[PDB]
Amino acid sequence: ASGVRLAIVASSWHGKICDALLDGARKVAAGCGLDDPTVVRVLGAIEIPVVAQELARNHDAVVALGVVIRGQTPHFDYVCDAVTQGLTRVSLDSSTPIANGVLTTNTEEQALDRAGLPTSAEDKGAQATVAALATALTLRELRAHS
Template sequence: MSGAGAPQANLKRKETKKLKLAIVAASWHTQIMDGLLDGALRAATDAGIKKPTVVRVPGTFELPVAAAHLVEEYDAVVALGVVIRGGTPHFDYVCEAATQGLTKVAVESKTPVGFGVLTCDNEQQGIDRAGLAGSQEDKGYEATAAALETVVALRNI
């Protein structure tokens, strides 16, 4: 796991506190998902956003359709999920569908969609990235910060 070279979040409350933020989170792998969601909510708080909308869906495969619905009403959407490799090609199909689906939603709607989907070979990799006590990274926070900073960047064009 790298993490090296990652930009520092620059959440400017003046520019972000009035943004409408939605977070859509999968439900599989509860410990990891709770960490990702906590990180996303912490980033929202740091940005001055008091009440982001949180929507839970069954799994990572359902993230794109939920995000497509939410972009109509929100300035930014953050998608959080985790897929852990197993012994079948299911991992590849779900990861590709989520990635392509969320990319399509962002590009077609012109709304930033934070990509907080962990694609891991094992559960420990997810724990290491979930922002939990002892984790090396906080991908929920990072995905939220990236989406909010992109809104600000696009508005400054």
């Protein structure tokens, strides 16, 4: 667990939630032996993929965190298409896991309930970190040694 190189890129739109997701990703990392993951912040979720690409050049895994919440127009749908499309492509070009902990909810109560705050049902920041670390460890054993 301890020897993996991990990066976390978190957007800042709905900053409060963003910070709650990043809290659960860090804590997961630190309990697995990783106290100094590369952490980067971006403004919005659309900026995540290009930053994830840069990070995957020299980390074993990248955790993509953020919060998108449906407004009054279709813009929500296109923002979510673009992030889904970018992350999948970056993982496969780089042959590196890019864990998707980007929340996509209709409401703010949904996001708060998915973010690992004191009374949340679940913590997606923490789940996405477990996923990336576990997957990087699986790739390690599949690949060439020794």
